[PDB]
Amino acid sequence: MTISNLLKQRVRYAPYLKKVKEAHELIPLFKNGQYLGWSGFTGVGTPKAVPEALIDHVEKNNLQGKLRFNLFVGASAGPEENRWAEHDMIIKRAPHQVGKPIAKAINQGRIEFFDKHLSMFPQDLTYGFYTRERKDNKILDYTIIEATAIKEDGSIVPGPSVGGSPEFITVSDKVIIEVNTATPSFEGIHDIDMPVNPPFRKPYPYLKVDDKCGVDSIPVDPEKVVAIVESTMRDQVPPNTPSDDMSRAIAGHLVEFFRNEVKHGRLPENLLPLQSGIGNIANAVIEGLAGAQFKHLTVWTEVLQDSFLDLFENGSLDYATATSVRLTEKGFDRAFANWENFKHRLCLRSQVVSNNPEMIRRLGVIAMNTPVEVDIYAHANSTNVNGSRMLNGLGGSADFLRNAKLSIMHAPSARPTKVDPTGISTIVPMASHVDQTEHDLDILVTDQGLADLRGLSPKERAREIINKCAHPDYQALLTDYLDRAEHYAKKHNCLHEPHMLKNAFKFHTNLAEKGTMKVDSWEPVD
Amino acid sequence: MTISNLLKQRVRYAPYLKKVKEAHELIPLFKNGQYLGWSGFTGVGTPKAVPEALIDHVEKNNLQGKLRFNLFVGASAGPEENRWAEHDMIIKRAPHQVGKPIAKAINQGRIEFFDKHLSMFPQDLTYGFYTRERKDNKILDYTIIEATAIKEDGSIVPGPSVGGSPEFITVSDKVIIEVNTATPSFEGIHDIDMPVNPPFRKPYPYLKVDDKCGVDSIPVDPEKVVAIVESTMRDQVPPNTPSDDMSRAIAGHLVEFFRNEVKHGRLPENLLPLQSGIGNIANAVIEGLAGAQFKHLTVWTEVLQDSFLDLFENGSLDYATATSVRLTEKGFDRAFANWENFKHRLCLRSQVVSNNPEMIRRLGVIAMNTPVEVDIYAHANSTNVNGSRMLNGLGGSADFLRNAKLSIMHAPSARPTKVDPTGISTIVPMASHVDQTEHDLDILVTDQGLADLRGLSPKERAREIINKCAHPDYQALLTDYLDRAEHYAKKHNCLHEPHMLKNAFKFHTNLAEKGTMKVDSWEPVD
Structure with missing residues (x-):
């Protein structure tokens, strides 16, 4: 905590240098059942120091399945989200994920998952639609946002991703900021629209793809921020897959x-x-x-x-x-x-x-x-x-x-x-x-x-x-199914979108029972 | 022939009085296979004189199934559309209908029907999406719009409905206007937004329910209008149904x-x-x-x-x-x-x-x-x-x-x-x-x-x-189905949205075969 000169250069708000803490020092703040928000999108810009400290704390004290959080992220997070699902640290997840451990945990019933339109998940979260059972007038107990620089007014300059960070900052009781000093500042790219709820909404003035607002930072209340964690870990993105002839x-x-x-x-x-x-x-x-x-x-x-x-x-x-x-x-x-x-x-x-x-x-x-x-x-x-x-x-x-x-x-x-x-x-x-x-x-x-x-x-x-x-290989099967369905619908006067509900899912059942969708014969329909 | 004094009062554009014609005089303009647009919505404000003239012409010359049109309307039309489907005068219909003869013809394969979002149908029509096979650079051969009054610049003041009338007027080769003199003028309560296609679109400046634009008429090219037909027939709206205890x-x-x-x-x-x-x-x-x-x-x-x-x-x-x-x-x-x-x-x-x-x-x-x-x-x-x-x-x-x-x-x-x-x-x-x-x-x-x-x-x-x-009566059946599906999904690690595709449509098949969805038992699943 010898406030690295790089950290001093990145953060330009003087009071924030008094809220610097190590990742392991934020452990007592987190409790079971809390609602957590993460900055980031598709695996880039997600916080790393605080989740890693939390994982280490869970491993040290053997808290697997006893220290769990309702994790809300703008989109799929990085490998850090995988290691929470591996340790059963997630109660509910929304609205996107890419990890294999996360998918296995969701499909085994260990994690409750509901997916939602990416344009409406932060908006509906700001309405309190997902924290209905809370009685303490809160929405998110903590938001954990990764930043690359901090402006002179205490606002947050995001990294390579924005996601639902504005809404998360809006509806969070406390804010934790990771200033990533291992990646160069992304200042100037972001065009950030702070959420406004109806009936106070105004049209977006954008006519082209390059129309901006002049707001390149997320305004956060300086009193809400409780800790500034220095992060030196860079995003881990897999190499692209070359295109094949299909x-x-x-x-x-x-x-x-x-x-x-x-x-x-x-x-x-x-x-x-x-x-x-x-x-x-x-x-x-x-x-x-x-x-x-x-x-x-x-x-x-x-x-x-x-x-x-x-x-x-x-x-x-x-x-x-x-x-x-x-x-x-x-x-x-x-x-x-x-x-x-x-x-x-x-x-x-x-x-x-x-x-x-x-x-x-x-x-x-x-x-x-x-x-x-x-x-x-x-x-x-x-x-x-x-x-x-x-x-x-x-x-x-x-x-x-x-x-x-x-x-x-x-x-x-x-x-x-x-x-x-x-x-x-x-x-x-x-x-x-x-x-x-x-x-x-x-x-x-x-x-x-x-x-x-x-x-x-x-x-x-x-x-x-x-x-x-x-x-x-399937044209004949699909044509035969469509012809039989058309004949049946002609019999029953439902020829708009003909179907055989008895045979509709036979490809899937045949794949389950025999390993291939190619069905030998359809069941007769009266 | 003399023009009605009431019609003179309603239409305030002098050149339009030279285009006044009876409904039966527009028969030669209509040919098989044409794309027709109708003003109106949910059965109100639809044209009546020209469709009735067409029906009478088909009856007189026995052209049932030989004189058919691709009918595009903003929403469901009134009883006029039912008599068109009863005579097989429709090739394709979009995107909404309420008639029983229309549904009977659609479900018997006599009419091709595709339904679409009501906010997107006029837009995609203006893009030429639905007239893709035309080679003569047209979209709609005729737009038939009912009017209550005509402004001093030749613009149309609609009736109790607007619908897709602006877009239909925009993409119509010729326009036929019925001035409905049997209903009082609806001037002043319309807010017409003339369509603009990308990349030239601007935000709607509406912040409230009552925010307006000042355009209370549909601008039309005076040369496009070919006829002005006087209509004296009111909309036939069925009486409302009293609410019941359900x-x-x-x-x-x-x-x-x-x-x-x-x-x-x-x-x-x-x-x-x-x-x-x-x-x-x-x-x-x-x-x-x-x-x-x-x-x-x-x-x-x-x-x-x-x-x-x-x-x-x-x-x-x-x-x-x-x-x-x-x-x-x-x-x-x-x-x-x-x-x-x-x-x-x-x-x-x-x-x-x-x-x-x-x-x-x-x-x-x-x-x-x-x-x-x-x-x-x-x-x-x-x-x-x-x-x-x-x-x-x-x-x-x-x-x-x-x-x-x-x-x-x-x-x-x-x-x-x-x-x-x-x-x-x-x-x-x-x-x-x-x-x-x-x-x-x-x-x-x-x-x-x-x-x-x-x-x-x-x-x-x-x-x-x-x-x-x-x-x-169905809670037990649904609970049993859900429990069996949950057990099956736990067996094969697909517990997110458990289903039994073999038994998924058994309610509908049982309704078809026995007249009730109450199934006696489910087919076993491995």
Whole structure:
């Protein structure tokens, strides 16, 4: 606690230097059953010192399952959140997660998990919708925010992520700040909108992706802050996965579709704001757009990667707006070697603003997200495997697909199992879990083709999806199911969206019993 | 032929008097396969003269099924649309309907129907999404709009409904105007927002329910208008249905919930803008709020009834915003006997503005919709019976429920069949069709109780719904299903949202085969 000169340089508020404490000194503040808030998004910008001290305290005193907290984070946290689920330190989690231990604990009943739209989770938290049973007029007992610098008025300058930090600071009884001295200051990128509750809300004055407010810090009450912890740990982001030829085919289909749209005037020659994120398909789509001679692109998304940095360097992309930027150490070197140019080409916003239906619908964003499965009537599954197993959470996909001008979903046509190389079909008679309904989807893309579902009736949607996106091994099965359902509905005068509820989930049951969705025969229907 | 003096009084644009034509004179303009746009909403304000002329022409020349149009209307049309479906004059319909012949034709495959969010249908129509196969650079061949008066610049002053009339006028090749001289002029209560497409969109400057723009007419190109038809036929609105004791119990539960919310400060003493429309339950809820001593209420909905007029008279309600006003002839007399006091407390907007996620989320609207069925995991069905039979269309329920501060769904706990007085259960193991997901719904209300689903995991949601909203005849069945699914999921480590896909739709299959959802036993699961 020899207040390192780096720490003195980062924090410019004199009273805050009297609230400096080590991570292990904050242990008595935390008690069982408390509601905790974390800054961060998709694993970047999350606090590390205080969670590590808490884990060490739990290990030392053998408090596994006896010292647990209701953890609220803006999005998925880093490996620190995994180690809480491994030690049973979480009672409830919301609204997103990426860890494997977290998913295993949730699916084993050890953790209660509910996922929610990323634009509405902090907003509904500010309404007190999630802390109803509290009787002491509080919402969050503590918020733990990672900062890179502190302004002269005591405000907090976030790191590579904003997330729900403004709302968390708003509705927290006490605030704990980690000043990360191992990463250079991110001052100047953030455009932070402090939440205002109705009926006192005003329109967002943003007309473009680069319109700002001038507020690059989170105003926090200096009396609320109880501790300033110096953090020297850098974010751990896995290296990106190179795109494979299933992703390149998807990207080529999407690029041809975009050229056709621009040719007909339905999109401008510079396209519209895009929201592309993490995944092999997203990188492949970005590369295909880069190689398609598209210029002056704009991005209004949740997360950026190293992929968009190449666009910045080669000039295909003009400006980018995201809740968080998620890039590796070589990305750190590339960006900070060109800090001045990087600053003027990226703006970091809160997840309530980035995923807001207002901005997405006003800007005409083009949405591209990956489903677990899409049935023949364009209802998409994003969270549950076979309707029960949580994978990651809904995230911002639901916010972006309903509001976007173009709602595009890209997925592999089929996935392998232990018995059949094409044992799982992305196109099914009926999705076991519906997250994005048929009223949100516009374009469905697989490695087999592109289905244009705009202005189509359910039977037309089914025929188009089976023809274009369905794998050749499942086209016959899906066509037979649709024909039988159409005959049955003609018998029973329900031919709008024909179905056989007796046979609807037979792919999933057949996968469970035999290891492959390829059904030998359907059960007869009267 | 002579032009009516009343028509002279209503139309104030001199050139338009040279385009006055009888309804039967516009027959040659209409051809098979054309895209037609109609003004109107929920059956009020729709054109009548031209559709009746078309029906008479089809009857005279026996053109049933040979003269058909792609009909696009803002919402459900009146009885005129029923006679069109009865003669097979519709190829495609969107995005909402209420007629019984229309649903019969759609479910028999005679009409292709796709439903869409009411805030997005005119927008996506202006983008050319639904006229993708046209090669002549058009969108709508004709827009048929009913008017009550015409301003001095040739603009249209709508009637009791706005709907998608601005967008339809924007994207129409030619415009046909019916000046309804049988109804008094509705001038002054309209707030028309002319559509602007990205990237040229600006925020809506509305902060309150009564914030206006000053544009009370729809601007049209005077050269686009080809005919002015005099209409003397009034809207045929059915009398309202008195509330019954299942709806009064629902209203009492909702009133107690609102009192509790105001007591805890989660709602202001004057509440927030409400979204209540047609139906016995909506009238019951309005009456319950009136008798609950709530004052200075505000309404931001789609449709008003004659019920809200009582609130206007007794002072419980201050201002109301809706796309259309749908009230009976006695209501017409009551409102226009006090036209000055009724003009100053109602504003009619376009359905793109009324159902916009931006305004709904900014104003903190309280949404109240009626689902067909809700499963134990809060996925609500609003359109399809048993997953196939179209009832009415999604409408604006999806727009309000996701964006509203409070998302409330109220439905009867059970419905009778020919064999069992409680043969249909609104609470089912799994919904055969998902329109509103678990990420949108907050409150579920039946005549048995109120389920508060804010911040609950799927198993907690299931327990709460079965305890509060499930009918006593189905509580045992739902509890047994949930327990078996929980055991099965514990066996295979999918305990987040446990399900038995083999038994998920057994309620509906048992209803089909035996006439009641009360299943004797479940199929075993390994």
